[PDB]
Design a protein around this ligand. Structure first.
Ligand SMILES: O=c1oc2cc(O)ccc2c2oc3ccc(O)c(CN4CCCCC4)c3c12
Length: 278
């Protein structure tokens, strides 16, 4: 995998012609190398490019990706796919591309499932979330995370909360590798980017590959992900939603054997698109 800006080449397209590329978008706290199992289950010579992390709200991230998508693929067709946060990013790009008159053929959400219940916007919720992260950081890094004063919780947005903790961490003098600090920073913000995403309507085909449940660690961070709606929270927004059950838990959906089901279904979709453009 070669990287150029925020674009990872997972399989380069031929010099000219060839099949429609699959554009995959990174998950919360990971890179697009996670899509290599999927690529192994897609038709031979299917190109694939991964869009890695950029800063901003979902819409601001899409505003950086959509111009690059068009630079690479022009009028279309567009195949946009993502697990975790990448599914929301793929969906946001599909909306932007459609608004610009581009040809989007397939949006693939790999268990990018909304919380079954609205997350309240209270200091109590912010507190519990940061204490759950403090517990995660102890079980994981055996490190003590500082806590934000209760009456300052609603004075800090997500970025500001993370900045507060990172500074107080370095001011506390705990030894944490910077590489872990940066992975933790992006994982926290990207998980919150899923939490706070506002889904816009999309008049187009979307396939939701739906696992059985979020895994325990996800539910420990935010228990409202223990509940799932049958449409994963997407039915009110998508005119043509196809829900493909894949079993397993959210963390397993990206890897074998669960990804074989995703690849088998997506390969048929890709074969139809290739036939349709020929
Ligand atoms: O799940 C997580 O893993 C992490 C793994 C890390 O290394 C670091 C941070 C986090 C992390 O910070 C979060 C903040 C809010 C929050 O709601 C969640 C739950 N997440 C929401 C999106 C859907 C799956 C569950 C997290 C979450």
């Amino acid at each position: 995998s070669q990287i150029d800006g925020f674009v990872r080449t997972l399989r380069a397209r031929p010099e000219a012609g060839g099949k429609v590329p699959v554009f995959v978008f990174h998950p919360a706290g990971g890179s697009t190398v996670v899509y290599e199992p999927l690529l192994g289950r897609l038709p031979a010579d299917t190109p694939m490019y991964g869009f890695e992390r950029v800063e901003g709200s979902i819409e601001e991230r899409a505003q950086q990706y959509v111009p690059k998508l068009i630079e690479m693929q022009g009028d279309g067709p567009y195949v946009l796919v993502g697990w975790s946060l990448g599914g929301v990013l793929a969906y946001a790009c599909a909306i932007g591309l459609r608004r610009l008159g581009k040809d989007v053929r397939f949006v693939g959400l790999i268990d990018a499932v909304r919380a079954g219940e609205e997350i309240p916007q209270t200091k109590e919720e912010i507190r519990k979330r940061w204490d759950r992260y403090a517990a995660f950081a102890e079980k994981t890094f055996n490190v003590t995370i500082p806590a934000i004063p209760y009456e300052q919780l609603e004075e800090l947005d997500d970025e500001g909360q993370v900045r507060f903790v990172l500074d107080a961490v370095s001011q506390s003098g705990v030894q944490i590798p910077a590489g872990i600090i940066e992975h933790q920073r992006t994982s926290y913000l990207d998980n919150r980017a899923i939490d706070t995403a506002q889904i816009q309507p999309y008049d187009g085909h979307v396939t939701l590959y739906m696992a059985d449940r979020y895994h325990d660690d996800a539910i420990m961070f935010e228990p409202r992900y223990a509940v799932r709606q049958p449409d994963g929270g997407w039915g009110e927004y998508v005119s043509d939603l196809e829900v493909v059950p894949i079993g397993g838990e959210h963390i397993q959906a990206i890897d074998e054997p669960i990804i074989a089901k995703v690849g088998e279904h997506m390969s048929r979709a890709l074969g139809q698109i290739e036939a349709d453009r020929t």
